[PDB]
């Protein structure tokens with residue numbers, strides 16, 4: 026089947042149409058890279074059902090590039106767009122540069138995402154802000170980052186780790202609150218936990234009118 | 235007049251029959267030394283009225299010799315006796331030795347009075363324990379010192395500074411308590427403050443049957 | 444009407460940086476959403492290479508960071524600052540202990556003390572020279588503005604380079620010697636009392652920038668000190 | 680039936696001290712009212728001079744005290760002990776700070792550190808030798824029983840000589856390194872566990888005596904160590 030831009034289900038392995046190497050999982054066969062849903066809160070969202078429509082000509086702002094695994098795929102999806110990946114920890118970042126080196130559509134921003142104004146003169150108006158940051162003020166960083174660059178009628182996907190926000194409070198009530206707190210700026214499109222793949226996260230798709 | 239052993243009232247100056255020098259007040263005229271009631275809680279008790287009958291052949295234990303001013307006189311009173319003066323602070327003691335040097339009836343005990351057993355093998359059975367120690371456990375030291383040496387039917391004179399015992403409590407109530415606390419071992423003979431001379435002390439005469 | 448984009452300063456025109464996009468890249472300071480597409484305003488400046496160049500730039504700075512974090516020289520400095528104050532703590536409670544002995548006897552051992560204190564007050568002036576040597580190499584843009592002494596303490600109080608580089612300008616004019624240490628800078632110290640606070644804010648703001656440029660560029664930029672001295676005169 | 684009077688040991692007989700009444704004077708240890716008149720038992724030993732001699736004795740010790748308190752040598756020692764531990768405190772939090780630097784870089788300055796630590800661990804062994812020199816002169820009877828090291832700490836923890844000389848034997852076997860320091864003495868350490876406490880009590884008791892004899896006599900008295908070793912064997 027075909028669910029996304031360059032997203033298919035070879036036999037039963039989620040993969041993206043690419044002509045690039047294995048950044049993490051040597052899962053690369055004839056023009057496709059296996060997207061390990063166990064190493065990507067995104068490949069998981071896709072499998073959980075809800076997907077993301079979008080043309081390759083997209084301007085992406087990724088908040089939490091990390092080592093660059095979930096990123097490396099988005100780069101295959103948006104092959105005719107550009108990715109401004111931000112990550113502030115050098116450890117993982119060291120591994121990130123290897124991706125941006127191999128690929129030519131990812132822009133490295135080694136700055137603190139917590140304060141967008143700091144790099145506000147680099148990021149253009151983006152069509153979507155993907156966030157996979159695990160910190161207490163998650164929704165804040167996702168909000169302020171939207172103000173600055175999320176072009177009106179743009180969409181965002183944000184991964185959330187209940188505990189990241191509330192140390193001791195039922196994942197349900199934490200997800201109950203956060204969704205409400207984030208509603209005030211975005212319009213919900215879907216939320217759903219990645220239960221098998223990530224027993225603590227839940228994806229929220231939305232956009233600001 | 236004549237009130238004590240070698241105690242008279244020259245014109246109006248309390249003095250003791252002596253043939254010794256001035257330890258503190260050069261108050262020495264033809265066989266008499268002026269007893270400055272302002273520098274002796276004892277010369278004050280005498281003036282306040284109540285006195286001490288006693289033959290020169292007396293065995294005295296003085297707890298609080300100090301520099302040796304009140305002592306130097308007692309030595310004139312008990313000229314045919316012996317004085318075991320105890321003081322544990324070197325500062326005043328340095329001045330004390332000058333008295334025991336001049337006079338030949340005072341025995342220096344540079345030990346802590348708080349624990350008599352420590353010098354229990356030096357002090358003999360005494361006829362009277364004079365105490366002028368200003369510390370919280372006053373009555374205790376006076377008691378234990380009595381057990382050890384105060385020969386049955388012996389007498390004691392103890393000076394007390396209310397504040398020495400109770401920091402913040404009306405001098406009356408403090409003297410009220412102490413007298414009661416000391417009754418359990420001694421038989422009262424008289425108490426009276428030295429109001430003009432020592433606006434904070436009160437003498438208690440007593441003995442144990 | 445000053446905007447700081449990665450290639451230059453827009454207002455309606457455009458002034459690029461002398462072969463130094465890496466600098467303004469680290470300098471793209473704007474405190475409020477832009478009313479234009481940096482991308483577009485940039486297409487109208489750089490050819491189609493826009494992206495290629497925007498990339499080569501974002502890659503250079505990224506590497507320098509990973510390059511320093513490989514050397515961990517900034518760590519050496521923190522340990523250094525943490526040892527200084529310590530070495531200093533003793534110098535004192537050992538003078539407190541000697542004048543203690545000395546208040547009594549002036550023995551031929553109180554002397555061995557003095558020399559040992561001295562020998563120790565030497566290591567202090569030895570470690571202080573060290574923080575200067577590095578700080579001038581691993582963190583010029585900063586040492587420049589406040590001076591090795593101060594610059595290095597922020598770094599230790601911050602913890603590390605990357606740990607500091609993400610500090611707000613407000614936490615900077617405070618994190619000081621636990622009126623932060625930046626308050627003792629001449630430009631601040633020689634003002635009135637109420638308007639000096641408006642100097643810290645600017646100094647702190649530009650200092651945080653110096654910190655970033657040091658960590659990702661490594662090379663000085665007098666545009667920094669410049670702004671500070673100027674903004675300083677303005678204070679009258 | 681052992682009684683300790685200022686001239687000797689009575690029971691019904693009498694054994695004077697070899698021209699050392701000054702010693703037993705400081706040793707007249709009896710924990711319970713006597714059932715006799717030391718004065719009388721003494722008249723039946725010394726002539727009529729009883730008092731004259733009892734006086735010359737009480738005067739000698741009194742002078743020695745005032746003699747020492749004039750020299751205040753004991754103070755020198757307290758300051759000394761208080762500096763030691765301090766000098767020692769730094770030796771440590773300066774090894775904690777160096778292994779901190781050293782965990783990162785092994786610079787040519789971490790070396791200057793090592794030598795300075797060493798030079799400092801020297802002053803420590805220098806001050807420790809000092810407390811020994813004095814303690815053996817100003818406080819033998821004590822150094823003898825527990826050893827300079829310990830003996831000197833009690834004095835510092837006590838505050839001064841006269842301040843210590845009035846401490847109960849119970850406060851002594853506790854005042855220790857704020858199971859006092861006297862508990863680490865061999866005679867205590869090499870017993871069972873429950874009966875070792877009965878050693879401290881004796882050691883402490885006799886130690887307080889040593890302290891008094893040191894302060895008023897200045898001269899050793901092996902009667903002290905004797906009793907301790909003996910009472911030690913007894914422990915079986």
Ligand SMILES: C[S@@+](CC[C@H](N)C(=O)[O-])C[C@H]1O[C@@H](n2cnc3c(N)ncnc32)[C@H](O)[C@@H]1O
Nearest residue numbers: 089091092094095112113114137138139157158
């Ligand atoms: C849940 S992890 C990402 C896992 C990622 N999907 C992967 O496959 O490696 C979140 C990442 O967010 C980054 N992060 C957290 N807070 C950040 C901040 N304030 N600024 C920038 N990056 C941040 C971390 O360094 C961390 O790698």
Ligand SMILES: C[S@@+](CC[C@H](N)C(=O)[O-])C[C@H]1O[C@@H](n2cnc3c(N)ncnc32)[C@H](O)[C@@H]1O
Nearest residue numbers: 298300301303304321322323346347348366367
């Ligand atoms: C109120 S003063 C004596 C004043 C004295 N009548 C005079 O004329 O100097 C009390 C004295 O008791 C002494 N003293 C207090 N507590 C003592 C103790 N536990 N053992 C020995 N002397 C003690 C002090 O050293 C102090 O000199």
